[model samples]
Target: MGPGFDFAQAIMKKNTVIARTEKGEFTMLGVYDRVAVIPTHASVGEIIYINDVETRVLDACALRDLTDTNLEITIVKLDRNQKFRDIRHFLPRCEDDYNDAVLSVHTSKFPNMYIPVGQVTNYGFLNLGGTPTHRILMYNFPTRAGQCGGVVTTTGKVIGIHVGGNGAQGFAAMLLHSYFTD
Candidate 1:
């Protein structure tokens, strides 16, 4: 697939898709599991969980290899009440495509970084039907949105987390593994 290939199919359009990663397939949801209606609203520092839907141990090692040491994560976004909307309307492929888009945006922003080395595995965007409130984009350089809850590589530990990206372009920001957990 090209760098701009839209794996919109990977998105879960209905509840039947749920979340799961089996074999080489992966499904990632937006963070917070809730859509933000206000702009500049911060969704970090929020605890979110992803259900494997099925029994599937993601190739953490493979992800590490693809993203080098950076941990690429796909979080599911939900409403404050824990309700969710179908992401397939805009993206109607599979979960894998959605996840890949997220990774692609990150990789496209920084084609030289080597910490978290991995291809776009799978991803999806969460919208509230009307105008999108807040969405993650890729930043040319790391910024505040990429720092908080971002992946950190320190002494010998590596932690990966999703952070906000620039709004001008839909580029998602990723914390360097070298800076967060080493």
Candidate 2:
């Protein structure tokens, strides 16, 4: 709600987040093991939890909308203005390749923030449709359920980002790859 919350408070509300197809559980992106491109989660009754401390998620693209047809994003939700912080700098998505035994970080500045390092069993470009994005699947990746869209790092540098996940294996969308050709 206010400043100095911890990690998430520095980034804009868009980067601050939470997600789910149901309630009680939500996902937060960007501020930690986060994303650079999309914060498009949140709709009526769909709760948005940011940082597990401070918050915002008043408006976002309409859920299940047909607009932005080509994008994989549900609703490109924008957050309110913040003090000043370069999200890209904090969570860089500039790694073209990935490494094994990656660390997956989660939590929105909460004291209980969890970080788990898993082995990279597989990595490749996700060719669903025409997207050039790479999807990294990991075994032993540990994180909270709502931590989808979190960041994945190796050593200390960001390599990819946390995507959707199952109870067993966690998923991530590798950055630096593009959907369109240069």
Candidate 3:
């Protein structure tokens, strides 16, 4: 492993939160100290119990050309009804492809667990459905059911959100920082 492959700090901070929906636990990336983002499909209700605090879905929208019926993302802002939570945020990586070894931090049967490290195999249009979507990040790693909304990071920079993929290859939605641009 390279020097940049260490994820000790990332795991300690535990910026990745779990959005407890009625369906299941959907991995979410905390941002701006109050906002979290997850896949639209995983969000079954308007309110989700995250980080032991309640949050509401602020908006659910598709990224530019990322309207593949299966992989849209949503934003949820944490409510101020409780004490301030010690949630950390990630710095988004600029550009689409950086050819770095990205880490997929997600919650499956266990919380805050990760699969083996993988590299960005490609970044471009691909088809999960009949139509091709643009700016999708394809990585050679195994993905699980409850990992759809996981955060993909590399060397402390947020690169993408693990949307979903088959056992052989997985895909993520890049430029997550765009959702928080305001």
lDDT: which candidate is best? 3
Q: For residues 1-182, could you state the per-residue lDDT of candidate 1 as single tens digits?
A: 33222232122222212222221211233322242111112322233223422222221221222323322332333323344552323322212212222221122123212232233322234331232322232323333322222221222222123344444222232322222121
Q: What digit string (tens of lDDT, one per residue) describes model 3 on residues 1-182? A: 44444652353255566678876777776665566667655645667777657767554454454354333556666663533233234445354555555555545465545554557754666675464555578888777676677667666566677776878788877744555766
Per-residue C-alpha lDDT of model 2 across residues 51-159, encoded as one tens digit per residue? 3433344444322213323222333233434422334444433434444434323443332343545465555543323533344445465454556555455543444
User: Once superposed on the true structure, which residue ranges of model 3 sit more than 4 Å away at CA?
Assistant: 1-12, 52-71, 80-94, 106-108, 129-132
If scored against the real structure, what TM-score would every candidate get?
0.21, 0.47, 0.74
The alpha-carbon RMSD values of the candidates against the true structure, listed in the order shown, are 16.6, 8.4, 3.9
Q: Give the worst 10-residue stretch by lDDT in candidate 3.
A: 80-89
- Top model by TM-score, which number? 3
lDDT of 2: 0.40
Error of 2 at 31 (Å): 7.2
lDDT of 3: 0.61
Poorly placed runs, candidate 2 (over 4 Å):
1-27, 31-77, 89-97, 100-111, 125-134, 137-139, 142-144, 177-182
